Symmetry: C2
Subunit: 451 residues, 2 copies
């Protein structure tokens, strides 16, 4: 039941959610801290309340938020991403209070919140995971036999005792033997067990993730994958959809594995299953975000499906009227994160105020933001200013569209990632579609720019 939606978030995502609601004709309620009394979502909402005793408490106080919703007759809550989005407890409290939490079941959020345990659940559901030892290694002979079937290179690491805890890469059996002896040697001197584990080494991995969407009636579909390999400090900077490594047959092969596993755990509403891909295009499950994804727009661009609006319809009890066969993938979409940070000083945040601000627009261009002149980047929340997304029929056209949009995006008063992004779009390998999670490290040249 959804008649009034309280957005338990802020920034660009709060705006995204509010727009979906306005389109559905659903009144909205915004919350905020005094430090953002002039924020965009506050102005766009039908109702808006300043709550909290500190910037973070505003969005993390479970009971106050539930009480407010109840106070103003808001029978549904959209957590967006981050904050209380994947808080199984909050989701449970909402249910008990009669409020519709716009997301998966709290039990599912709980299950998936346990990364090691969820990996076991997914594995048993038929989802591929990185192969390795079934617990501690029994001996060197077992390690040598295990390595042969999973294939080199492999990783050896001690998980107990006072011996060295650094991971050891073994590229052939000789290295394995030497690393195993050195490791057990260090454990003995510390009078204990090393509890050595072995795992397949997925080198120069790509971050490939699948978008999941299901209604509360058993229909669960996937909206293809996204390649979010280009990060820094594990912080995403550029994302694309679909990926360039999966063929249509493999896209569906992993896609069906994804939806089969999702159905098995009773998952509904929006979700993302994150994998790591090797040079050959093989995927291995890592974890699942049980919430809307920051980079969801690229998938929307190539499938033409409004994910956030569907989140609300599904939470309302509506049936997902899209069959897997109806999910098509047209062209490519790229998303660049426009953050107030200095990539040269290792992305330190520019907590200042935006002066000049011009947003690019045109054919194939989409902008997700809450900024304008006066926009301020406080030290309390993320440094995101906007999310620029471009769509085109082919990879190279999408790259050129993005660069052209970035080159016309004026922002002053703060340093941003725009110069960096522009260089990436011009970089030889990225243009050729060649990149892994270590792309930036491998291209220090993209950080060289007038400034």
């Amino acid at each position: 039941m959804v008649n009034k939606v309280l957005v338990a978030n802020r920034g660009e995502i709060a705006v995204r959610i509010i727009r979906a609601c306005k389109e559905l004709g659903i009144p909205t309620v915004a919350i905020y801290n005094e430090v953002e009394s002039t924020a965009r979502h506050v102005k766009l909402a039908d109702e808006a309340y300043m709550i909290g005793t500190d910037p973070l408490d505003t969005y993390l106080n479970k009971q106050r938020i539930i009480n407010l919703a109840l106070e103003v007759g808001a029978d549904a809550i959209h957590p967006g991403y981050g904050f209380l989005a994947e808080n199984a407890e909050f989701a449970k409290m909402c249910e008990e209070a009669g409020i519709t939490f716009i997301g998966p079941h709290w039990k599912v959020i709980e299950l998936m919140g346990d990364k090691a345990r969820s990996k076991e659940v997914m594995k048993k559901a038929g989802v591929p995971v990185v192969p390795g030892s079934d617990g501690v290694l029994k001996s060197l002979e077992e390690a040598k036999a295990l390595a042969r079937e999973i294939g080199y290179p492999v990783l050896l690491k001690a998980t107990a005792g006072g011996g060295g805890r650094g991971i050891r890469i073994c590229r052939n059996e000789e290295e394995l033997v030497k690393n195993y002896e050195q490791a057990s040697r260090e454990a003995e001197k510390a009078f204990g067990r090393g509890d050595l584990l072995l795992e397949k080494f997925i080198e120069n991995p790509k971050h490939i993730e699948y978008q999941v969407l299901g209604d509360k009636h058993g229909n669960v579909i996937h909206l293809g994958e996204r390649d979010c390999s280009i990060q820094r400090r594990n912080q995403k900077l550029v994302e694309i959809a679909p990926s360039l490594i999966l063929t249509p047959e493999k896209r569906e092969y992993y896609g069906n594995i994804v939806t089969k596993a999702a159905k098995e755990i009773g998952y509904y509403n929006a979700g993302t299953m994150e994998f790591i891909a090797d040079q050959e295009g093989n995927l291995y499950f890592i974890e699942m975000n049980t919430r809307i994804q920051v980079e969801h727009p690229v998938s929307e661009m190539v499938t033409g499906i409004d994910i956030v609006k569907w989140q609300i319809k599904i939470a309302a009890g509506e049936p997902l009227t899209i069959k897997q066969e109806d999910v098509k993938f047209n062209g490519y979409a790229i998303e660049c994160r426009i953050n107030a940070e200095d990539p040269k000083k290792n992305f330190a945040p520019s907590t200042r105020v935006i002066e000049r601000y011009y947003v690019p627009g045109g054919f194939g261009i989409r902008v997700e933001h809450a900024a304008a002149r006066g926009f301020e980047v406080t030290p309390y929340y993320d440094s995101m200013i906007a999310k620029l997304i471009t769509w085109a029929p082919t990879w190279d056209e999408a790259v050129e569209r993005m660069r052209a949009a970035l080159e016309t995006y004026e922002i002053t008063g703060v340093k941003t990632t725009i110069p960096l992004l522009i260089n990436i779009m011009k970089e030889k390998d990225f243009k050729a579609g060649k990149f892994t999670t270590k792309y930036l490290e491998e291209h220090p040249e993209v950080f060289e720019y007038e400034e």
Copy 2:
């Protein structure tokens, strides 16, 4: 031959053209008057020159512009719309100077510039026009016979002598007889001929227009129609694509008539054939704009074809690699003109400066603009601030998307058409898809708003 493009325009269209060029990797050259030294296109162009002795002379001085292009090695000129866009002379001068005019042949621009004569050319090409008398009426008997075959109501009007020149509506033969006698009576008293003409009366007409696009190799296709009935002072305010009155079969029927006629006159590059439609959906040709259309974006949204980029590729001599059968129409797109004007005081322009300015964005939202804080509306050019376009699978969803976007579009410092637009989106008939060129006159209620 196109290696460097000089944009002989300004405002939002100059930005649109520059973006297309940047995407193609073509350097650009901008021109401007001192009064707009901080305009957007000036900043976005690779080269920019302040020229002219007055605001209009900047864009209308044919020889100075040709000379500059030659001076900086610009072998192509894009006129955008308005100004020198449909100046057959300028187009001719460009050719003679060895510059590629991005538009149809100058002879074609000349031909079509003669509205009465072009209507005769199109008629002979098989294009339907409003039926009427073949010159002056010979007698009352001929008028009565002519009216029966073209169908009532009809229009009678004197075109010579010192008699009354007002048009006379005749809804049946009796009215025709009485109007004919009164008209000839007035002519006799003035000692001369009335040169009475009769024409079919297309009452409560819709403005339906077809988008044309052809290469210099004989392939000419149409990109469907647009309904631009919602105007004021004949000034467009809201445009949609495709229209709601034509069925797919009629869409193609008129479409093929359009492309057949276009090919017959040797038309290439972008063009628009404007018609008026009656209550039954029958079209009658009025005139043709031999240039890019202001409202071209809605057609781009529903066909997925980049018209401006194609203008450049075609001018370069490239073949239009799109067959008519490949032209599909998906969903609906609406475009609202955000102008600095007061609709309550009969759209008087607000020649001031924009203070707060927030551009909406999201799924299905496109913005064409050159504005930002500081943007100024001088009294020399149009009052357009931006063009907001929304796309959705169905008519009602597109309407709601537009209203939601408009409600989130903040602009202060000047009065705009936003409040007016919002009311139209909420209006019962517009929502139902019922509207003609006299929509505003028939709905004074949309002008009632807080202010």
